[PDB]
Symmetry: C3
Subunit: 262 residues, 3 copies
């Protein structure tokens, strides 16, 4: 049902069964499918396509020529009723594409809250984007990619299938990520390699001097020590019991399947 | 004429003279020009622009914000009635652009059948795309480019004007192809360089153990022997009279004008 | 007001207050905001969004799915009535985005005349594009970028914020420009480095043999001499009093803030 306080442009096509929340705005020439839920205050500017089994939260801004909930590009997909979930206060810019999941990959593509997805950013099937992320122009995620909280993907940058981009990571523009990126690190190149800790990002996000130092020491254990990952994991765990920010590393290691960028 | 069994959305604009086949679907806000032919069962999802002298075959799926048959980007083009041909069962994704040819370049842009053209793939004037190809997100072909059967162009990858991408080639993502790529080879980098035979692709497509070995030996003649191309061409021709799959090389050599990637 | 000789498609939405010039063409499903001015003979093909405080000149061709005058992607922007200016005889292709300025960056995004902006070219907030430029497919300018007269940005190429691309420059495809590019030079790579003078471009644009030689000598002072920029600036100024084309260098130096690509 469409809430009485929602605006739906006469030219927009909202198919019966769609749920449109209070004070939502559906602009000219938009198409909204029957299995779509659009939250309170969310705006679809114009020329937006939203379909599939897709739930969109509150106060989102979705710009013209964006395609949300669409059939994914995985040749394995066969039309199964898979899902998209999008949180609150996201800015989803022109030509952004966010595709539905696959049964094989868990059935769900997820995007959190307060994200900025710039022009022609691509979120493929079965991706999980967290909160407060930035995907710059043409930033492209292949299937099953995780982008953790506060992570930034630079312009023209592509991420290989199944890769994890750790929390607070900054991936430089014009890059190609082929393996997993630990939280807090700077990555650049093709293939992308690590370039230290995202110190400036952490400073701006309120991380203490002590926390940043501990994170830098954890980085040094991984990349400078010359030891194997299995050797340094318990050392990182010991460090984490004093500095809880370091726990991001161990949580990341348990999820990592592609190996680390080096 | 529009076939009686074709669906044309009330909001779609199909100009008089356009030919729409049986059980075709023209979605909301589509524009179809007077010199366009759309084949049986072909679907234009929504917000699709098809114009120029353009023939589209059967069972195609063309997604929103795609531009098919449009004026090309060659500054030499002056509005001449050039052409686009598109075959059957293609999946042409959001924002894909396929441009009409130029008189100078032969007057025709051609795409075969069973191709997957991912988001924002670009097929410039006078290009020839074969059958069963994959162009990943943002894959960009300059004018007069050939992409032969089964070839794959990775995400964010650009191909220089007049280049040929051989049959069964896999070009890696984030690459820049400046010269001709022989059939069956893996290419990566900027500028792109060869990295052996696409063994896995050939295995999946039913190539025999003997054929793959012969193809590998042909690759070795080209790249490992240290001999000139003119020296190894007759040797490849001799090999081809036992293994007919090797004939792909000699057929490719006759078309090649840019020299080989090395 | 809409001029009596202008065409506005019944499906187009031109908001009251918009100024549409003589013999302009507003195609199907276009949206034109109340603070937009569209000049004599300008064509919006179809599915074009033009909003904000935006002035567009004469004889422009703006293609489907383009977004002109839109809210920029700078997180600092807060909805202030900033501006876009676009000159005459530009060809603005499918999915091109040109964003309004920011108060912080001067309030204006400017594009001159006779430019070709290819598919999905991006002109960010506070950019200044001159005359006769070419931005190829997916060419991406970050905020506050200057692209001077006749400059060419290759396909898949990104330019870092605040950078200046000098007059008559050719930036190769698949590149990443991180610093300022002097006029007349060829740039390629990631990060982009200089590769001599754009001799062919200058020849075609009517530059004399003497002028090109002088420009080459200025290039050699900057890059071959081994001297500092401060040492060679007065030498370039001396050369410029015989060959006025060399004055482009000194004018560029005064604007440069990022340092030179080397
Ligand atoms: C990084 C920038 C690229 C742009 C990213 C945006 C694209 C995404 O929206 C779509 C996507 O990533 O889907 C893939 C899916 O994430 C993956 C896992 O589920 O599976 C697929 O990728 P994968 O690497 O597993 O390719 P396949 O094993 O399915 O084979 C697809 C084609 O590649 C050929 N191939 C494969 C391996 C090889 O070594 N050589 C080949 O030629 C093979 O013959 C076939 O034609 C999926 N692909 C296809 C084309 O089906
Ligand atoms: C690889 C990724 C890039 C994106 C690919 C998508 C673009 C295609 O849709 C369009 C396309 O490829 O068309 C070109 C056409 O395939 C070719 C052959 O027919 O001809 C043209 O390319 P080319 O390399 O021949 O350029 P021109 O010789 O026509 O000159 C165009 C501009 O380049 C300038 N130039 C040329 C050479 C040089 O050395 N320096 C220059 O500055 C010249 O002054 C002029 O302003 C065409 N270009 C233009 C801009 O007209
Ligand atoms: C080059 C190809 C990329 C595509 C280009 C197209 C994008 C443009 O349309 C938009 C644009 O360029 O705007 C930026 C604006 O030109 C600039 C100057 O005015 O300011 C901004 O860029 P900047 O480099 O200054 O980034 P900020 O300092 O504003 O911080 C933004 C985010 O980066 C994080 N950051 C910053 C520095 C650092 O070292 N590590 C970080 O994690 C920080 O925490 C925050 O989340 C602006 N960005 C944002 C996201 O606001």
């Amino acid at each position: 049902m469409i809430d009485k306080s929602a605006f739906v442009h006469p030219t927009a096509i909202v198919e019966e069964g769609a749920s449109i929340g209070a004070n939502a705005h559906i602009g000219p020439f938009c198409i909204v499918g029957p299995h779509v839920e659009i939250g309170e205050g969310t705006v679809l500017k114009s020329h937006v396509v939203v379909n599939g089994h897709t739930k969109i939260g509150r106060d989102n801004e979705i710009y013209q020529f964006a395609s949300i909930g669409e059939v994914n590009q995985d040749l394995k997909y066969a039309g199964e009723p898979t899902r998209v979930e999008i949180g609150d206060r996201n800015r989803i810019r022109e030509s952004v594409t966010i595709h539905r999941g696959t049964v094989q990959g868990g059935g769900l593509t997820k995007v959190g809250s307060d994200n900025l997805l710039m022009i022609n950013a691509h979120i493929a099937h079965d991706c999980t984007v967290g909160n407060r992320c930035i995907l710059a122009n043409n930033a492209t995620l292949a299937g099953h990619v995780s982008v953790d909280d506060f992570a930034i993907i630079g312009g023209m940058t592509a991420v290989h299938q199944f890769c994890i981009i750790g929390a607070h990571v900054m991936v430089g523009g014009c890059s190609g990520v082929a393996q997993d990126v630990p939280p807090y690190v700077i990555a650049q190149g093709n293939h992308a390699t690590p370039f230290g800790v995202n110190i400036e990002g952490l400073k701006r996000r309120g991380f203490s001097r002590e926390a940043i130092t501990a994170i830098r020491n954890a980085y040094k254990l991984i990349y400078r020590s010359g030891k194997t990952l299995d050797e340094v994991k318990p050392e990182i765990a010991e460090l984490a019991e004093t500095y809880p920010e370091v726990k991001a590393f161990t949580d990341f290691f348990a999820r990592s399947t592609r190996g680390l960028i080096r």
